Amino acid sequence: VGSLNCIVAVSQNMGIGKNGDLPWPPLRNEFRYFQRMTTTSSVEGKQNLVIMGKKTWFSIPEKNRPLKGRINLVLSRELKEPPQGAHFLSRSLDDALKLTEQPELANKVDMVWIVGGSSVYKEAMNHPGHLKLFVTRIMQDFESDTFFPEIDLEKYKLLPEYPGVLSDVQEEKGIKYKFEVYEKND
Template sequence: MARILNGIVAMCPNLGIGKDGNLPWHPTRLNEEFKYFRKMTATASVEGKQNVVIMGRKTWFSIPEKNRPLNNRINIVLSRQLKDPPHGAHHLAPDFISALRLINTELSERADQVWVIGGSSLYKELMESQGIRRLFVTQVLKQFPCDTFFPELSTDDYNLLPSFPGVPQGLQEENGIQYKFEVYESIVH
């Protein structure tokens, strides 16, 4: 059975997801939003297995060193330049397709859910790939300066789900910043 692939992202109203290698609202922290990210990406649904997080090289290096690798998850970094996994990463793959192949072969006994955590081009590949895709989007309801953006989300390709297990409903607020959690699922054409 083909895996459902998940993407998880927090974005501004203009689809901005980053600024200068940080989250757009940096240095403000959204601790509850971060706990949600950790819970979603680290909680395996199958006993004895671990979730996989796939990220680009820039996303890897944007994570504070003390937090790398993301614990309780198999960390795969994508890079065409690097020859070896960066210090702390579990695996290196040259591209998204190679990462998925690694998960379905060498890691198949250990891997549970697959989460794409950034950046932009990797999200775009995920969204354009075949099969069932879920996008866990935190809509930050305040605009911040951004230099990195999430791909346009087409309602022809994705439906907003009314609710999803484990995803808080309604408006959230931290440090004067309001946000809401949304889950989109790909429409199989």
């Protein structure tokens, strides 16, 4: 199994969601970036795995659900089986990562992408080992009711560029944003 990663888009006030949707209006190219980064795998005969909490799963409109071309895993202790359209269900983050090593998935999964929400991000980020964060900084404040956990910059280094990630300011619907990649190894 290849690398472990988180990917998020976050306002200046650290918001990632409001009422089960994003705090900002739809940013089509931002979403295209999320789909590209999470779907593209350099290893022949493998797909990437996306890991998400239950409320994030149900935030994806049925049209984009499961995320196509990726294996979709949902975290929940209440659910008894994967939701309609999902592929896997685990009861903890550690369980989901252990599962990638089982015979059913060990030779099928390339990268692992944690796609939210706030508790899953927090636990992924505080878990020893090699981890990258792909963070889109939406450069305005937006009313939110979720939030991204604190990024400890003593351990997460902001990389000075990264292949396949544009380094300059983007703008859609009058909202400027930029792409960042952070890496820790502890």
